[PDB]
Each structure stands twice: as C-alpha cells, then as structure tokens.
C-alpha cells in the first residue's frame, strides 16, 4: 500500500540513497568522486531530513578517514573551529542576557518606541537587524537578536496578538508569525552582511582574491566604494524581502485569510496596547545592577568585535599581534566574566556597615551553568563543524578543481546570459556549503574566464561574490540559518518554501543593479580596461 | 566578620588568586612563565571549585592568544580533539544502551551472578572494570560501566538497602555508597589501564619513547613481558584500593553506621533478595530486537576498539592505511547506525504479508537526539579539551622543557630515594595534566638522567611510566574522573579526600614490586647492562 511510502519514506531514503548514488563512486576513479558521492548523499539526507541534521553532520567523521581524504584526527579538528567557538559563545552570551530578563526590558522599550503594531514591529526589527549586521558578523547579530524577538513575540502573545507556537519527542511547531519573525531575522542578517566589507567574511574573502589576482587594476574595492555599490541594492532587496515575508506569512496583499490576527490587532492596538505596555514597563522598576552588568558586558563584547581589524582604523588585532587573535577570545571572555562577577554587590555592607540586611550565603553570579547546558542547542556544534569539515574535504579531495573546470565550459554563452547563469550557479553552490568555501571555489575560475573572453573581471566577480552570500533555503547553508532553526525549532520544508522568494528577489535585484548601477559606480565596467588587456596578453 | 569569609570565600579566591599569582608573570620574562601562571591559576580554581570546572576550562581560549602562546584558531581547534570525539561518542553509546533499558538487564544479570551483597558486587564490578580496561581505553571502559553502575545502585535502592542521594538549585549530593561505587569504577579503570601495553595510550607512549632512545636493548617491553611485569602489582594495588574504598566509604574495619547498614542488608540478601531479583529479571520480557541491535552495535564497537592496531596480531587499522583511522570511526559510526537502524522492524510485515498491527507512522530509531542533548554532560567537551589545550600550550610555550630541566637536579639522591621521589613527582604532575603529556615531559628526561648515573634505564622509566597513570585526586587529572564527576555529581572535595588511599597504596605497591619483582621479570635491572654503558659513553 501507499501508506508504506507515506510513513517509512525517511527509512527508504536512508537505505536506498547510498546504493543509488554508489555508481558515481564506482564508475570513476579519483578520490574527487568518492568525496562527491559523500557530499551528494549528505545533501540528500539534509534536504529530506531522513536523519536529524546534527546526526547527518556527524557522517564526515566516518566517511573521510575511510575514503582516505583526510585523517580522522584532522577531520575532528576541522570541527570546533574558531568561528564555531564564536557562535557557541554568542549563544551563551544571549542566554546570559535572557537570564537576567534584560531581553524583556529591551523588548518593552522597543515596543513602546514603535507602537505595538506587529507589521510595524516586524519592519523595525528587520531594518535594525540589517543595519546591525552591516558591521558585525551575521551569526553574532542573529544570536544577539533571537532573545529580543522571543521577548517581543511573548509580549504580543500576552496582548492576545497571536500564538507563538502551534498547540499539540517532536518539539513544538512554530506559528506563521514566529516563522515570519525568525526567518526575517536570519534573512536580514544574511542580506545586511553584504552591504559592507566588514559585514561578512565572504566579502573579505573575494575582495582579497580579486586584489591578489589583479594588481594595478584601476577599479578598487575600497571601503567607501564597496558600500556605495552595495547599499542601494542591499536596501532594495531588504525591503523586498520584508514585503515578501509579510505576504507569505501575514498575507499583506491577501485580505481573504492569515491577516485576520494582524487586522484584529490593528483594530484594538490603538490605546489599550499603549496603556498595557507602559504599565508593564513601569512594573519592571529601575534597572538592577544585574542587568547593568550584563548590558555593560554585552556592549563591551559588541564594540570589542567591531574594533578587530576594521580596515578603516587600527583595530585591537593589529595590536597584540604576537598571535592571530580572532573574535572567539572576547566572547569567551564575556562568558567567563559572567560567572566571575556577582549579581548583588550587597556584601559590601560588611565593610561599609551602611546597609542593614546581610546576604547570609554565597551571592549568586550573573548566570548558572545548569542554565547554559539546558538551553544551548549543542547539536549546532556538529552541524556547523560538519559544514566546515565538508568544505575542507572538498578542498583536499579535489572537488574544488573538478567543479571549477566544469564551470569553464560556459564561455560560449552571451554576456548577460553568462552573468545570470553565474549568479544562479553561485546561489546553487552556496546553498550546500560554507559561503567562504564557495567563494574560494568560484571566484578564480570566474576571473580566468573573464580574462579569456575579454570582460572586465569585476562585472562577473562582484555580482557572483555578493550572490555567494544569498543562502536562504537550508539550515546548513549559512550559520544564521542554523542558529534560527536551533533557537526556535524550524523545519527545513517550510523554511525552503519561504526562502524560494528571497532567492528570486535577490537574484533579480543583484542582476539589475549590477547592469545599471555598477556603471554609475564603475564607469568602465562594460568596456575592457587597459590593465585587463595587459593581464590577458600576459596570460 | 568571620561569616564574611564563611559565605564569600569562593569569589574572594576568584578575585585575589590572579593578583597574588601575578608576580609569577612579572618577575620572570619568558612566555613559559606566563603559561605557568595561567596553569597555576587554573589549578587553584580547579582545586577549590571557585568557578564551575567547565567555565574554568574555557580560560585557555582567552588566555593563550592574549599571552602569545598560540593563535586563537589553533587553541580552539585543540579542543574537541579526536580522543574527545571518542569520549563523547562513548557517552552517546552509553546513552543508547540506557535508552533501551539494557543497563537494567545487565545489572540484574550481574546481581544473579554475585548475589546482591554491596561488598561483593563492588568487588566484582571493580575486577570486571579492571579486566576490561586491561585491553581498552580507560575512558571508554568508564563510559561503558557508568550506566551499569547506575542500574545496580537503582536495583539496590529498590531493595531498600541503601539511598542513592542525600535529601535536598545545585545538583543532588551523592551518598557514601554512590561515591564508593563510582570512584571504584574510575579508579579501577585507571589502575587496570596499566596492566597491558594496550591498556592505555600512556603505555604505548613511554614504550615508544624507550624504544626510540635505546635500541639494541636486550630488555624488551614487548606485549608478553610487559604483562608479566605489570599484572601482579596491578592485582595487588587494585585489591588494596578496593579494601581502602570499603574501609573509607563504608565500615569494613570500623564499627560505624555504614557497617550496620551493610550487615543488615546482607541479612536479607541471602534468599529473599535472590528470589526478588530473579522475579524482577523475569518481569523483563525476552531480550527484544531493540536491545538485540544495541548489543550487536556495542559489541562491534568494542571489538573494533580492541582489534585496531594491536601488537599481538595485525589489526584492521594496518590495512586501510591511506590515513590513520585512530579509533574515532567506530564510535561515531555506532552513533550514526543507532540513528539509522529502526527498532520494531514490524514495518516489514507489508512485504512479508504475515499480518498484525502496522506502525501507522515512522518507526523510531534506537535513540533520539532530545535524549542525547538532555543526558550528555556537554561541559565535558570544554573540561576534557582544556587538558589537551593546556598540554599543547605548555609544550609550545616551553613549560614542559622547563619542568624537565627542573627535574634534573634530583640526581643527588640515592637509588631508592631517587625512585620514590620520581614516583611522587610523577603522581603530583599527572594530578594536574593529561597522562600522555606528563609522560612525554618526564620520560626522556628520566632516560638521560639514568644514563648520567650508572642505573639501568628501565629501573626508572618503567616505574614512573606506570605512575603517570596514577591520578585519583581531581576530575581534571584523568578522563575517567571527569566522566564519573559528570555522570554522578561528585564534588571535587570528596574525590580529593578519597584519592589519598589509592595514591599511597599505588605508590608503595609500585615501590615494593618494582624493587622486588622487576628483578625476577627483568634480571640485571639492578646492574648496568653493556648496551647502557655504550649509550652513556656516547654522550
Ligand atoms: C562499511 C560500510 C557499509 C556498512 C553497512 C552496514 C549494514 C548494517 C545492517 C543493515 C541492516 C538493515 C538493512 C535493510 C533492512 C530492511 C529495510 C527495508 C526498507 C527500509 O528502508 O525501511 C526503513 C528501514 O531502513 C533501514 O533499516 C535502513 C538502515 C540503515 C542502512 C544504511 C546502509 C548504509 C550503507 C553504506 C554503504 C557505503 C559503501 C561505500 C563506503 C524504514 O525505516 P523507518 O522510516 O521506519 O525509520 C527510519 C529511522 N527512524
Ligand atoms: C582582565 C581583567 C579585567 C577587569 C575589568 C574591570 C573589572 C571591574 C570590576 C571588578 C570587581 C570589583 C570589585 C567587586 C567586589 C569584590 C569584593 C571582594 C571579593 C568578593 O566579595 O568575592 C565575590 C565577588 O567577586 C568579585 O566581584 C570578583 C570580580 C572579578 C575579578 C576578576 C579579576 C581579574 C584579574 C585579571 C588580572 C590580569 C592581569 C594581566 C596583567 C563575592 O561573591 P560570592 O563569592 O559570594 O559568590 C560568587 C561570585 N558571585
């Protein structure tokens, strides 16, 4: 009966996909094809969720050493990379923020500012997340903003606006409002990361590749110039993504259904919302030393990130350059200082004798370890590490050169068709791997092809470089996606269905504003500059 | 003001110890001394638990890049090493055993074997852990045995013979019987790991070091001779450790409250306990397919552990030699298979058309990720990776070489005094670091030192090599202690107080059986062999 395929399809996928994909390993000899078999099987498992994502990410530990691609000691060391430590520490700091109930105060403040309208709050949070991710790592901003969204949605639930999770092992199903807000936060982080060189590591990666490959090039990826090029498109597809997400979940253009909850809130969100919200903000009372310390540490951590090799002034990484200190150090420092510092300071009454009451016990610190263990989604370690290790295995096993050579054959296509196909290929490749890895795979081949067919290298590289960050479909596509799927349990199916929109929006906007606005930014993009001719003649 | 110390001593230590230890950094200029300061502060925090051990273990991530010892990326990747992946996977496999309630079945079987007497069960469990750790890694055996010990304690408590936990934010305080059993398992693993050259990585490490420095040596530390030397002493001090644990946590030689409970529970442990246990075992149905598959996978994992590069015969790691598999593949493979393999296998009724109820849904795997996240102590990742990171930073910064050069000055002592002091130093050093790291630090220095004087190199290397695994005082001294502390919440003070017994017992036992039995196993140990004379002359 069809019920067998309806119920055990996950097990059928698990049992059959390796056997069905075995021919790619059998009919070809090099280790590139063994690694391609592994990648294809892992991607198929990721898409269908035949196994838990965290479990599927464990597969490289078994596959790589057996296939001879890398040693098991190396493969495990590719997990728990520096950026993974940064992500985990950021989650810990967000949990510390939540523990002192600072997130509730911040959410009350922002709702008091905006006006308790779910559409207006959604727009404001999306815009602030985009502007913030313009300067800080995307996953850092996502882990930052998850508790704020949780508190805002909790307040909306308290006002009767909506239900956070669907009413009933399997974790609770998030509601369309919850999906909208969280997916919007993730998408805003991803989009805002592209507006500035500091915005994400992919921008630095392909900017450095372009600079090293092409010296004496008239057109520069200077810090203000890159912003001038990217901010218009960034804003345009950010607003378009916000409009699409509102249409997909809250029925912005559809009054038939799914807008009733927001329409209801709009009718009764005039004055009762204001009174309840400002009374509740009065209820919390003055800012306690607990929240003061947590907020001071948080602001310190954010600034400490931002001043690490910004490129516009001497960051603290240029100082203390004995060893390469990356952004994991400040985060773990904040996590440790959370435990080291106390939360009362009431014990000073011993020396001062001014205060009457005495704690009569050990004063609790800013956070407890049992809180961290209970709330941290520890599987994200395996998921993000698996992404990094899969990227490294793709580098070493030779998949990189294979895909790069496969990309060369597109020389026959015309100019605009070539640009569109390159953007599509970049999006498709970055859907299944770390963004920096995909940029490393794709950019040099694009540069050589551009020199081959007499095209300005930027005309192909820069749109493709920005497209490498357009990851919106799977939790494994980019760390913000994994963080959102972990903080609020979000399934992959509806996530990909939602992300089918921003992909098209970003592709179209990037193509259009390349072809039009890049000429304004770079007057000689369409033509072939002299230095490009010199490099082509040399090669 | 005494209550001020009595209530705020932990944070006072936190605030004062770095300032008091700062002269270590200020007075001496080398980076080895900065690393020494970091290690001293971390050790002081470890001993007093002024911070949670997991939080203290995070300190290297911040400290090493700041002091220039190592880069941030390398320090973070030192954590979650291959061996730590093995340990965490072993914990996950133990959880898989627990989920199918196999641990209760095994505990009931053992109770039937021995006869429901806590003294006799403790003795039997200690000896079984001994024998199994003779061939497998100590941490693997500890993770294996922890669920079985939990099950047997639960069965005893259900008989009403003992209480697992004391009466009640902090985790429950374990009772005397729980401490006795768990510390017995940890100590037995650590002891039995020294019986055989395969028992622990430290044995292979110092055997390889000795074989490298000295070649053409008539005395061989091969598989049979090493066992012949080690088994008698290992038996003696493990029996003495069992006696000490019985004497301390219970009243074996003292008439105490613990003596009364043991005898009163042994009075009803003759036939009534046997009948009750047999009935309880028969209450469990026939060993089901879920437990069948868990047992098969577990036995396969153990066999892969043992059959991976043993000296006796050619192992599976010798083939597939493109990359060194190094034991991480079997454990993660077992975890993955536990997630893939079904449990009921009743779905096959469709193809067979035999008949019966149908699943009406997906058949669950052997384990669930929610159970893994809830029960795995994830701080163990930081705690165990801290040891590896600290060892690597110590050897790169030069602390290890500093300690080795410091130990040279002991050559003025007489031979017996030299042996005693060397064993004491080895125990004290291994109390604060990984056993392999301590062996790498001390053994070559010991070899050169024994060449300097006219002393057989084995006479010093082998006793100290065995002693390097004699760590029983702190959870950070050796992985089994950390796993036992994580599984059952054992405060560092209790384990430190229990560690005097095994420490003194093993020190005296090693002294006596070296000086006596080593002559029988290795004749001419007292004298100076010709090859040693040639090696000393060539210096
Ligand atoms: C050394 C490398 C090879 C190792 C091979 C190990 C084999 C171990 C023994 C396998 C025993 C099971 C064999 C199939 C049993 C009958 C399957 C019936 C059809 C089917 O798939 O039903 C599902 C069960 O699948 C299942 O039971 C699938 C189980 C997992 C099979 C994985 C096979 C991997 C092969 C890899 C080969 C690699 C070669 C190159 C290196 C229903 O499942 P459900 O939906 O009810 O539940 C899903 C989990 N919750
Ligand atoms: C890298 C350093 C960065 C420093 C940045 C500025 C920090 C400013 C604030 C520091 C603390 C100000 C004083 C607070 C009151 C202390 C009173 C005495 C100690 C005391 O009562 O102990 C606990 C409070 O400890 C505490 O309050 C301990 C606070 C943390 C001290 C950390 C010292 C690090 C020194 C690093 C030196 C590096 C040198 C490099 C050349 C009481 O609490 P309790 O024990 O009852 O309960 C468990 C804790 N909640």
Numbering used by the authors:
A (entry chain B), B (entry chain A): 33 to 200, 214 to 584
Paste lines from the article.
The I’m Not Dead Yet (INDY) protein in Drosophila melanogaster is a homodimeric plasma membrane transporter composed of 590 amino acids, belonging to the family of divalent anion–sodium symporters (DASS). INDY recognizes intermediates from the tricarboxylic acid cycle as substrates, with a preference for the dicarboxylate form of citrate at pH 6, and the anion exchanger inhibitor, DIDS (4,4′-diisothiocyano-2,2′-disulfonic acid stilbene), strongly inhibits its transport activity. Therefore, our biochemical characterization confirmed that INDY is a DIDS-sensitive H+/citrate symporter that predominantly recognizes citrate in its divalent form. Each protomer was divided into two domains: a central scaffold domain (TM 1–4 and 8–10), which plays an indispensable role in stable dimerization of the transporter, and a peripheral transport domain (HP1, HP2, TM 5–7, and TM 11–13) responsible for citrate binding and transport.
Apo-state structures of INDY were determined under two conditions: using nanodiscs at pH 6 and 8. The apo structures occurred in three conformations: (i) outward-open and (ii) inward-open conformations in which the substrate-binding site is exposed to the extracellular and intracellular sides, respectively, and (iii) an asymmetric conformation containing elements of both conformations. At pH 6, INDY exhibits two of these conformations, outward-open (43%) and asymmetric (57%). In the outward-open state, the substrate-binding site is positioned near the extracellular side at the membrane outer leaflet, and F119 adopts an upright orientation with respect to the membrane plane (left). This configuration allows the substrate to access the binding site from the extracellular side, while preventing its release inward (left). In a similar way, in the outward-open state, F119 in the downward position cannot be packed against TM 5b of the transport domain without encountering steric hindrance. The ability of INDY to adopt multiple configurations in the apo state highlights the intrinsic dynamics of the transporter independent of substrate binding.
